[PDB]
Design a protein around this ligand. Structure first.
Ligand SMILES: CCCCCCCCCCCCCCCCCC(=O)OC[C@H](COP(=O)([O-])OCC(O)COP(=O)([O-])OC[C@@H](COC(=O)CCCCCCCCCCCCCCCCC)OC(=O)CCCCCCCCCCCCCCCCC)OC(=O)CCCCCCCCCCCCCCCCC
Ligand SMILES: CCCCCCCCCCCCCCCCCC(=O)OC[C@H](COP(=O)([O-])OCC(O)COP(=O)([O-])OC[C@@H](COC(=O)CCCCCCCCCCCCCCCCC)OC(=O)CCCCCCCCCCCCCCCCC)OC(=O)CCCCCCCCCCCCCCCCC
Ligand SMILES: CCCCCCCCCCCCCCCCCC(=O)OC[C@H](COP(=O)([O-])OCC(O)COP(=O)([O-])OC[C@@H](COC(=O)CCCCCCCCCCCCCCCCC)OC(=O)CCCCCCCCCCCCCCCCC)OC(=O)CCCCCCCCCCCCCCCCC
Ligand SMILES: CCCCCCCCCCCCCCCCCC(=O)OC[C@H](COP(=O)(O)OCCN)OC(=O)CCCCCCCCCCCCCCCCC
Ligand SMILES: CCCCCCCCCCCCCCCCCC(=O)OC[C@H](COP(=O)(O)OCCN)OC(=O)CCCCCCCCCCCCCCCCC
Ligand SMILES: CCCCCCCCCCCCCCCCCC(=O)OC[C@H](COP(=O)(O)OCCN)OC(=O)CCCCCCCCCCCCCCCCC
Ligand code: HEC
Ligand code: HEM
Ligand code: HEM
Ligand SMILES: C/C=C(C)/C=C/C=C/[C@H](OC)[C@@H](C)[C@@H](OC)[C@@H](C)CCc1oc2c(O)c(OC)cc(OC)c2c(=O)c1C
Ligand SMILES: [Ca+2]
Lengths: 143, 57, 233, 59, 178, 190, 534
């Protein structure tokens, strides 16, 4: 995954440049349609955005440096090079809808700010995420 | 000597680890049923006993 | 003093109240009523509790965060009271605006139980029909409701009783004398501030609350127990 | 003028809903992997509709 | 480049069945439980076009009331609620979910994958978007009505001191869920 | 004959998710800094940071970084295939995270005891929104560690459970970093 | 130990051994939902004990008295002796509030446990021949439980309870022709009456509890006699029972579940209020409250009273009040419930003798009818508390009564449709796995490029790998590999370290051996069943 990891440095350099430019400009430049002073929202936003693209670019690069030459990253790969297992995928699950319902109960409790609704929604949410994450591991019944 | 789980694959010790945080030996998620397993098996060795049910008509 | 107070009140009125109540407090046809003759009590209740300014017409204006300080509220109340008087605020013997001293007619440090016992009957006859036993609230016609009596301070309870806000009836001091109002205040604040002896109150709504509690979660946990003890095959 | 043509633009969805509904259950059947003929992308290398796991074979 | 052998007994694989030939009960429990990216994509697209019809109906009420100078059937409040919710529905319940629905359907077909990476997270995304829509539109069921501060929710007009109805909260949690 | 090394898919998904959680906390930090600018425009900010308690904050910082070291020891245990080392270190990490959140709750209780609240000042609003959202993220992290311990209790320890443990370690490292940054802004430079 | 003597006496005097031996070997199936009836039974036991306790401190008289007692915020207030002794239970008796709280919580749990137990009986089909008598007894029991709870909360003579007595009296006067005469019979006069609370008292403590105990005794005797039903499953036929014997397993399980229900009701009794009668004040015909609802098991009746329009008949010098049609509707529902096995016999054409339950997915009409009746009952319950709904979620109260009216039509229809299709979908999902086997979730790429998901057949296979599809047997079909056991833990030991290897290997050996033994037991039993049908 070379090109994917490497193309995250375009926007990283650009957003860092725009961050420093915006910062110096908003603190030093004066025009009649704004008040001079560093604008903190855009400052923090742009530097953290460059942080996000830095994060992905660096992690994906640090992975790329020790993955083998895969057939999907090769220009003349034969279709039989990926023959074998591809991986495990969930065939079905009721718990995504369950989680959406838990989050719905939580959000309506937050709306009305009923304390019992917030408590029950948080309980439902931890339960449904737990049951999602225990789906393919529940024991066989021992009776 | 240190402990290894009985469900853990055996491996070439020069090849590092079965899995680590950056890399795996599979493109998707590893299976809960152990990747060393090969499916299907015989129905006899799943242990499912298919019932025989007759209801009164 | 009072003329500087009336100046401050007029200036605040001119940039916050003048679109719905008019420059001479006469009212604007479908935006707001006339304020001529409402008194300082009406302005105190409405502004201090946060009900004014209304910012959209509906079935009922709601209590929200106040837009003006208490001093600013009293400035506006002075200015409105100059346009034809009305009922005023309850001041204590020293001259401060009365607050915890209204907690029963025989107040002296703590609430006395005779006041609570008479104010309970007064509240259960004149008030609880709309606000439920112990003042948790109730629903009226077409999106209207009687609020929860927790947020109101003692002055606001008194001025609510005097001014009859929105669909609330008026209770003059000839109808419910001063002592009967103070006992109603004592009862509200006793019940609003005494934890139930039998554990969690479940909002004090009445049987629907305990219903929901049991008939969902109570039977759910014992179904969980049954599934723990029994077989799913 | 704007509102008159707005109601026209609102009527525009009536043939669209009817076309979707009718064609979903009585529409002309597709007998080829690529009924437009010149599909560039890989989705036209598989059947209409694809099987559960998309590809019965890859080119 | 390698060449395969002309293998014996070869016949092309079987074609799946088109739509409209479904037996009853074939999609209810499947919809509720599926992690197939492409059924999920069809669900996304149907959902977003239904919301398109809702928001557009709000827009046509707006255009009806702007037809002539006076207020013929709407109030100022109701007109404000209408443009606010037209904007929110069309951007956040039609636009973004139809983007992700088309992506869900065609993207694994375009790159040559069998599934998407995280199937149950895909299912979760669909259902949480639907719940966000339901929450956002639930404000209209109040007596005061929906939110009426424009889809931008400018402040201090969005503060509780200046927009106290419950719909103003519902709008927030709606966009959050989406 | 052997199989090729590929990117761990679940790790990639977790890192993308943690990038967007960093972008969540961006906004709260921006709120803080706008508030701080307005507060230093008349020197009121310093009088509100005169309620802070830097030694105690540094203490719970030490505790949280120790817990992150602990969960990385657990990661090592997992990738070697050892359920018992993992199951030990993750419990130690859960204990340390519980200690963190209880200490932060005590910090709130004492700050409320003498002034600072959401309503009493703009400083209190910024302080409690930022530290409260972070504490909620810490509580979700310890929830994650407990659910991992359940998973490896009642399902055999294959690599599929090891990957889960490793990505929950990634999540705990993210909260540790958010704490170091939040501690550096609201306690040191103030 | 001396037991030789004890048994020798007992048997010698009563010829006892054969009978008790027949009893200790009785088999019970152990599905979890077969516990639900026990919950109601244990609730009833708690109700009797706490009830007798409360009779030692309660004076059911309507005579007025000035209160002087523990609760000082009602000192000097005139109240009936009923309300006064309720207050004295609450504040003068040590632990009295705890016991009254437990009594009321147990009443709620009693009615809801009977409700969900009846739902098991309905959806699983257990009412069918030979078990319609238990259905009839049971609907009588649940109606009597409602009536008992009404008379129970009516006794303390607080304001909220007296409003409910007022309403019941007003229902009874409205009935033609005999409404006024019925009222003067029940109450012994105009309402409120000198004998009102005393008749309610003896109904509540003696008469209805006696009908309830006699009917529970007949019910449980009849379930013991006609042995318990069971689900389809390996080895399970119409002509047997499979489960666990009474001694030691089922009896210990029942005593433990009784402990759990007792302790749960005891915890409720302390950590949450249920009827702060002191906050309501004594009864006054002129006063009322906003959210003055009855208890949850009666909310459906109140909701009926709310949704019925003002359809009143004026026949010259006479009139049939609007609230007549409420009583008609409620009566119809009640009569329909008690006569369900018989209309199902009419419309299914089945009158056979059944001992194997049905899964609710396999019988979609009954499931959909039951669900739409649950939606009907839940909408009547929610309309019976609609003003609390409106106050707390800010809906229009007029919109809420209209939601009640329009929804008692459209809601059950939508519910029937949704339920029917979900039933058939679960049904069809079972056939998918009996045809093609369990989806393992593993996706495997073939050399031609195909992605194929590995299935696991549950039965034999054809020469081309495709399974030979098994027949549906009425039982549950496993849907994931962890159900067959392929995620079971392969290490034995505590939390912080393993067991020694000598124990671990031997233990896993024993475990695998017992699994094979149990499987072969069920397979041999299943083959004996096939053979016994020739
Ligand atoms: C749970 C409820 C339940 O059991 O319902 C099952 C039942 C389906 O019947 P079944 O017995 O389970 O299966 C047999 C069906 O015939 C098998 O399904 P089908 O043959 O009906 O085909 C699926 C269905 C369509 O699928 C569904 O109805 C289910 C998936 C969507 C549901 C979620 C979104 C619904 C809207 C929410 C808005 C708020 O097709 C159609 O209805 C015709 C085509 C779409 C036109 C009709 C919809 C108009 C609005 C959308 C305009 C779209 C413009 C074009 C976009 C491109 C389209 C490719 O009803 C539904 O699924 C209703 C869905 C909710 C409405
Ligand atoms: C309702 C009871 C009733 O009317 O029973 C009539 C029934 C007359 O039937 P039968 O035709 O004489 O029975 C002759 C059998 O061939 C011979 O009896 P079986 O082989 O059918 O089984 C009898 C066995 C069967 O019953 C039991 O083992 C369980 C106890 C009865 C059911 C309890 C729950 C209902 O009950 C007894 O052996 C009763 C012994 C009483 C011991 C009391 C010591 C003092 O009498 C009993 O069942 C005896 C009940 C004695 C216990 C009452 C309480 C004593 C304390
Ligand atoms: C449900 C319980 C369940 O599935 O638990 C799994 C499991 C099943 O037990 P198991 O150990 O596998 O035993 C074997 C079964 O016989 C396995 O037998 P099964 O697989 O046949 O059992 C499942 C059965 C179980 O089904 C039942 O028993 C039905 C009970 C639910 C009542 C209806 C919902 C209430 C909605 C009220 C709304 C107002 O469901 C079905 O067969 C079909 C679906 C039934 C529910 C469909 C949803 C209702 C849609 C209608 C919504 C209304 C819309 C309009 C609203 C009004 C507008 C104004 O139950 C539990 O362990 C759960 C315990 C409770 C937690
Ligand atoms: C674990 C404990 C969690 C469950 C607790 C259930 C009890 C609900 C409760 O607390 O009720 C009181 C509550 C007051 O609100 P509160 O949360 O205290 O917060 C302040 C308000 N902003 O009240 C509320 O917030 C609203 C509660 C009203 C619920 C609906 C009432 C009308 C309809 C009810 C119909 C009857 C019940 C049906 C339920 C069973 C159906 C099978
Ligand atoms: C517990 C589970 C959550 C239940 C619902 C939220 C908790 C209750 C709550 O938020 O109540 C509000 C009340 C103070 O809010 P209030 O001042 O009334 O706001 C409007 C007027 N200013 O709240 C309070 O005064 C109580 C404050 C503590 C609430 C607990 C929050 C849990 C998460 C933080 C834990 C901190 C460490 C311990
Ligand atoms: C679930 C999703 C939402 C998360 C939980 C909701 C918020 C948690 C509790 C809120 C209640 C609260 O803490 O209120 C502030 C509290 C009391 O305030 P007050 O009544 O004014 O007391 C003055 C007396 N000194 O005293 C304090 O200020 C104590 C410090 C409170 C810290 C707040 C922690 C959480 C903040 C971030 C999450 C909230 C997100 C907003 C809700 C949606
Ligand atoms: C129904 C007809 C009512 C009766 C009887 C009483 N009140 Fe009321 N009250 C009612 C409404 C509809 C409102 C809302 C008014 C508004 O403009 O918001 C109120 C308001 C109050 C308040 C204010 C509470 C607050 O939020 O600050 C109080 C303190 C109050 N009412 C008290 C009260 C008392 C003590 C009553 C008996 C004497 C009483 N009200 C009668 C509706 C009704
Ligand atoms: C022998 C059996 C019973 C006796 C002796 C008994 C006794 C009593 C007594 C004396 C009261 C006094 C009022 C009070 O304490 O406030 C009461 C209340 C009550 N009873 Fe019973 N009872 C019995 C059975 C039942 C049953 C079987 C039920 C339900 C089906 C029930 C439901 C109630 C309820 C709900 C109350 C109201 C409790 C309260 O509001 O505090 N009782 N009972
Ligand atoms: C206080 C009331 C009740 C008690 C104590 C009670 C108790 C029991 C018990 C213990 C069982 C056997 C175990 C079980 O199935 O859970 C049972 C079975 C049964 N119950 Fe009830 N029940 C009550 C109410 C009802 C109601 C309301 C109905 C139906 C309307 C009903 C109908 C049945 C039937 C038909 C059976 C036989 C089921 C079978 O054999 O599988 N009972 N009851
Ligand atoms: C000795 C007794 C005998 C012979 C009784 C015979 C049966 C009569 C009726 O059927 C004819 C019966 C089904 C039922 O009436 C629908 C009654 C119980 C009345 C139930 C009832 O209570 C309420 C209640 O308690 C309340 O408390 C605060 C409040 C209520 O509304 C706000 C009600 C209510 O609205 C109804 C209908
Ligand atoms: Ca117009």
């Amino acid at each position: 995954m070379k090109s994917s990891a490497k193309l995250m440095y375009g926007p990283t350099v650009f957003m860092a440049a725009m961050a420093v430019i915006y910062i110096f400009a908003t603190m030093h430049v004066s025009d009649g349609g704004s008040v001079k002073g560093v604008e903190w929202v855009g400052s923090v936003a742009l530097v953290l955005s460059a942080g996000l693209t830095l994060m992905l670019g660096v992690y994906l690069h640090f992975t790329e440096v020790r993955v083998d030459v895969l057939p999907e990253d090769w220009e003349e790969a034969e279709v039989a090079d990926k023959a074998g297992t591809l991986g495990f995928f969930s065939p079905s699950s009721i718990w995504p809808a369950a989680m959406s319902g838990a989050v719905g109960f939580l959000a309506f409790g937050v709306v009305y700010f009923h304390y019992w609704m917030i408590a029950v929604g948080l309980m439902l949410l931890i339960f449904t995420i737990t049951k999602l994450n225990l789906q393919y591991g529940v024991p066989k019944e021992k009776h | 000597k240190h402990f290894v789980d009985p469900a853990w694959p055996e491996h070439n010790p020069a090849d590092g680890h079965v899995v680590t945080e950056l890399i795996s030996k599979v493109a998707g998620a590893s299976s809960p049923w152990g990747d060393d397993k090969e499916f299907p098996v015989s129905a006899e060795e799943t242990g499912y006993v298919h019932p025989y049910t007759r209801i009164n008509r | 003093d009072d003329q500087a107070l009336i100046s401050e009140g007029k200036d605040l009125y001119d940039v916050a109240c003048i679109t719905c109540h008019g420059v001479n407090l006469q009212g604007v046809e479908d935006r707001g009523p006339s304020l001529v003759g409402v008194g300082e009590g009406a302005v105190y209740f409405q502004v201090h509790s946060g009900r004014m300014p209304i910012l959209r017409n509906e079935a009922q204006a709601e209590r929200k965060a106040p837009r003006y300080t208490e001093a600013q509220t009293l400035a506006i109340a002075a200015y409105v009271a100059a346009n034809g008087g009305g009922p005023g605020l309850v001041y204590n013997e020293d001259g401060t605006l009365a607050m915890e001293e209204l907690r029963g007619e025989n107040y002296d440090g703590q609430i006395t139980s005779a006041d609570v016992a008479r104010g309970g009957d007064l509240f259960r006859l004149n008030c609880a029909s709309c606000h439920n036993f112990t003042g948790r609230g109730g629903a009226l016609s077409s999106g209207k409701y009687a609020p929860n009596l927790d947020a109101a301070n003692e002055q606001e309870i008194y001025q609510a009783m005097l001014t009859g806000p929105q669909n609330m009836p008026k209770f003059s001091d000839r109808q419910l004398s001063a002592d009967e109002k103070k006992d109603i205040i004592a009862f509200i604040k006793s019940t609003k501030e005494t934890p139930s002896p039998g554990g969690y109150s479940l909002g004090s709504l009445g049987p629907v609350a305990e219903g929901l509690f049991m008939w969902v979660f109570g039977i759910l946990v014992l179904v969980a127990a049954a599934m723990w003890i029994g077989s799913r095959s | 003028i704007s509102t008159v043509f707005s109601f026209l633009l609102g009527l525009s969805v009536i043939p669209f809903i009817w076309n979707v509904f009718k064609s979903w259950r009585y529409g002309e059947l597709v007998t080829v992997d690529d009924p437009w003929g010149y599909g560039n992308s890989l989705e036209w290398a598989t059947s209409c509709p694809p099987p559960r796991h998309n590809f019965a074979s890859l080119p | 480049t390698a060449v395969a052998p002309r293998v014996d007994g070869h016949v092309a694989p079987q074609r799946p069945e088109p739509t409209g030939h479904a037996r009853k009960g074939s999609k209810a429990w499947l919809m509720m439980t599926t992690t197939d990216h492409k059924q999920l994509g069809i669900m996304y697209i149907i959902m977003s076009f239904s919301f398109f019809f809702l928001g557009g109906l709000m827009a046509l009420l707006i255009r009806a009331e702007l037809f002539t100078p006076g207020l013929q059937f709407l109030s100022n409040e109701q007109f404000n609620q209408l443009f606010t919710m037209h904007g929110t529905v069309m951007l956040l319940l039609y636009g973004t979910p139809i983007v992700w629905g088309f992506a869900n359907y065609v993207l694994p077909l375009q790159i040559g994958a069998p599934d998407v990476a995280f199937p149950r997270l895909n299912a979760f995304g669909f259902w949480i978007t639907t719940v966000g829509g339901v929450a956002m539109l639930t404000g209209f069921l109040t007596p005061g009505g929906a939110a009426d501060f424009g889809w931008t929710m400018y402040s201090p007009l969005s503060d509780a001191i200046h927009s106290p109805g419950l719909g103003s909260d519902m709008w927030i949690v709606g966009v959050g869920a989406t | 004959v052997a199989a090729l090394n590929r990117p761990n898919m679940v790790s990639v998904g977790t890192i993308v998710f943690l990038s967007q959680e960093l972008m969540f906390f961006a906004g709260l930090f921006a709120m803080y800094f706008v508030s701080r600018a307005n507060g230093l425009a008349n020197g009121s900010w310093g009088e509100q940071t005169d309620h802070l308690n830097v030694p105690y904050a540094l203490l719970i910082t030490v505790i949280l970084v120790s817990s992150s070291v602990t969960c990385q020891f657990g990661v090592f245990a997992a990738e070697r295939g050892d359920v018992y080392g993992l199951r030990k270190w993750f419990l130690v990490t859960i204990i340390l995270g519980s200690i963190f959140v209880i200490g932060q709750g005590y910090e709130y209780i004492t700050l409320v005891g003498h002034g600072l609240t959401i309503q009493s000042s703009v400083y209190g609003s910024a302080f409690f929104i930022t530290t409260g959202f972070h504490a909620l993220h810490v509580i979700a992290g310890v929830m994650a560690f407990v659910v991992v311990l359940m998973r490896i209790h009642k399902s055999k320890f294959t690599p599929a459970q090891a990957t889960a443990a490793m990505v929950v370690s990634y999540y705990w490292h993210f909260v540790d970093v958010v704490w170091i940054g939040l501690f550096i802004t609201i306690y040191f430079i103030q | 130990m001396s037991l030789a003597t004890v048994g020798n006496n007992l048997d010698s005097r009563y010829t006892m051994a054969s009978g008790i031996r027949r009893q200790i070997n009785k088999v019970f199936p152990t599905h979890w939902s077969f516990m639900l009836g026990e919950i109601a039974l244990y609730s009833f036991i708690v109700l009797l004990l706490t009830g007798v306790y409360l009779t030692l401190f309660f004076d059911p008289s309507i005579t007025k008295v000035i209160y002087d007692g523990g609760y000082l915020p009602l000192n000097g207030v005139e109240m009936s002796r009923a309300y006064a002794t309720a207050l004295d239970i609450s504040f003068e008796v040590r632990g009295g509030l705890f016991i009254r709280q437990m009594h009321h919580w147990a009443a709620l749990l009693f009615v809801v446990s009977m409700l969900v137990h009846m739902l098991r009986i309905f959806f699983t089909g257990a009412f069918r021949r030979p078990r319609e008598a238990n259905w009839i007894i049971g609907v009588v029991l649940i109606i009597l439980g409602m009536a008992e709870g009404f008379m129970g909360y009516s006794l303390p003579d607080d304001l909220l309870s007296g409003v409910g007595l007022r309403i019941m009296s007003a229902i009874i006067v409205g009935l033609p022709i005999i409404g006024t005469w019925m009222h003067w019979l029940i109450f012994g006069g105009d309402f409120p009456s000198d004998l009102m609370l005393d008749r309610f008292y003896i109904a509540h403590v003696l008469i209805i509890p006696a009908i309830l105990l006699g009917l529970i005794a007949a019910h449980l005797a009849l379930v013991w006699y006609q042995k318990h039903t069971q689900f389809p499953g390996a080895g399970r036929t119409e002509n047997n029972v499979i489960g666990i014997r009474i001694m030691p397993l089922f009896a210990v399980k029942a005593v433990a579940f009784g402990l759990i229900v007792f302790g749960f009701l005891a915890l409720l009794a302390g950590v949450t209020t249920i009827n702060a009668i002191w906050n309501l004040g004594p009864y006054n015909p002129s006063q009322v409250s906003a959210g003055s609802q009855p208890d949850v098991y009666m909310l459906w009746t109140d909701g009926a009273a709310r949704v019925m329009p003002a359809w009143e008949l004026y026949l010259g010098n006479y009139t049939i009040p609007a609230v007549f049609w409420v009583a008609v509707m409620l009566g119809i529902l009640v009569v329909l419930l008690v006569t369900y096995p018989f209309i199902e016999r009419k419309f299914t054409g089945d009158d056979a003798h059944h001992n194997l339950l049905q899964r609710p997915r396999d019988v979609p009409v009954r499931t959909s009818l039951g669900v739409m009746a649950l939606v009907f009952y839940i909408l009547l319950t929610v309309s019976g508390g609609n003003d609390v709904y409106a106050m707390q979620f800010h809906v229009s109260l007029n919109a809420m009564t209209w939601i009640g009216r329009i929804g008692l039509i459209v809601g059950p229809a939508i519910a029937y449709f949704i339920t029917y299709r979900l039933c058939i979908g679960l049904q069809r999902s079972d056939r998918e796995v009996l045809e093609h086997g369990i989806e393992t979730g593993i996706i495997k790429q073939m050399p031609n490029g195909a992605f194929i998901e590995v299935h696991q057949p549950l039965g034999p296979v054809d020469d081309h790998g495709h399974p030979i599809p098994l027949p549906y047997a009425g039982a549950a079909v496993p849907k994931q590999m962890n159900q067959l056991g392929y995620a079971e833990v392969e290490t034995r030991g505590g939390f912080f370290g393993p067991d020694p290897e000598d124990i671990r290997a031997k233990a896993k050996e024993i475990e695998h051996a017992n699994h094979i033994e149990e499987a072969n037991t069920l397979r041999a039993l299943n083959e004996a069943n096939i053979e016994r049908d020739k």
